[PDB]
């Protein structure tokens with residue numbers, strides 16, 4: 001018998017991460033619709049190449065609510081931790097050996113039993129792990145400072161780039177994988193490889209700060225940010241489509257029931273309620 | 282390595298045509314057979330050679346090349362997509378459950394009750410439940426009071442679906458009063474329903490999102506639209522249905538994800554699913 005080790009990642013509005021209070025508990029708060037926010041204690045590190053000091057923290061959001069629902073449905077207990085290197089996960093050459101980093105590496109090494117995060121389903125990862133059916137259907141878009149005018153993914157300041165207009169995504173992410181694998185995107189990939197950010201929050205802040213002119217990322221995140229911060233807009237629009245899934249090892253005994261529960265939640269309105277609570281208000 | 286595969290006509294995902302009276306399928310089409318009865322006083326019938334094309338047929342061609350299999354494609358005759366009737370699945374789902382087909386390809390919606398009896402590939406077309414109306418009809422969604430409490434309005438709103446598929450199953454489970462109200466407006470098929478909307482005999486048609494988005498894109502005059510700027514309730518996808526424990530699922534899943542990631546899928550969407558509107 002064992003508690004599930006759940007790994008997640010900071011990524012608003014799917015996973016908020018906040019300090020505990022002095023006594024080690026999470027502050028009581030309420031949603032926009034008046035209901036209490038469910039929070040869980042999640043351990044993780046508070047700069048690349050430095051030692052990582054793990055401390056208890058508070059986690060909540062769309063994905064944490066989804067976790068609580070799966071746990072109650074399928075009757076498992078769990079402990080949540082934040083991925084130690086802060087990355088979603090890619091497979092990089094080391095040497096002809098390869099390794100996965102990020103949440104993918106923690107799941108494959110046994111440090112995690114389940115990835116519950118806005119984790120994009122793609123061919124590269126599905127070779128190594130099991131994904132559920134998608135709990136969110138979305139795609140990629142482009143975030144810019146209000147007033148910046150670019151048409152989209154085919155705009156010549158992206159396709160014929162210079163140092164005059166800088167764009168980027170998140171290191172060791174599915175967007176990084178996407179641009180690296182499609183030869184037709186190699187001009188964009190070589191430009192971004194010089195400017196990619198360690199996390200989405202840092203990249204978004206860099207757009208607000210006019211140090212990054214366009215950020216290419218998940219539309220589910222970017223449209224939420226633009227709904228909250230009026231100096232930011234997305235520019236259009238879904239140029240690639242993908243979904244987020246729960247990640248498990250291929251020999252997981254939970255994998256069938258997790259997918260059935262995802263499907264039931266789309267069908268009975270639970271997933272829309274989460275959209276209403278965390279995403280679309 | 283030679284696989285029985287079942288499908289069902291639903292443009293533009295599967296489109297069925299007569300064979301050249303050459304008996305050869307040409308162009309972008311693949312052979313598909315249909316069992317046609319001789320009469321209604323015998324179980325005898327004939328296989329009729331037809332030709333099949335469409336978004337899903339293009340997917341099957343790519344999977345056959347990539348995963349490396351050949352197939353004999355046939356059109357389902359016992360039901361349509363799949364419904365559980367007295368605890369027995371019919372339609373494409375039933376053909377897979379009862380091991381007459383190795384896989385089912387078409388406009389086949391992934392839902393929880395089907396996933397209990399077949400394995401589904403990853404979704405390769407996003408879909409759900411949408412609502413088609415005449416442009417400017419004010420309906421918030423499925424949760425609109427005009428749908429949920431229809432006799433609160435005088436005269437009441439007239440809306441329906443095509444019974445026996447995933448959309449009617451969802452409504453029956455979620456909105457019991459709406460479901461029993463709307464069966465009076467059951468439509469025999471998508472073409473009948475669009476004619477009913479255009480002539481004012483129906484106010485809304487509730488149906489598969491991907492098919493309605495396709496029809497709205499090609500509506501003469503762009504008068505019929507889906508509500509909420511193409512809003513989808515109960516997001517899901519079409520999926521390839523396989524027997525539970527199928528040894529083909531892993532490869533088929535990896536191949537579909539490869540087509541999505543390398544651009545092959547958006548090519549088929551441009552080729553088959555674009556519309557002027």
Ligand SMILES: N[C@@H](CCC(=O)O)C(=O)O
Pocket residue numbers: 362363388389390391443445446447448449488489490
């Ligand atoms: N795609 C649906 C059919 C149409 C519908 O009910 O919306 C299914 O697989 O049942």
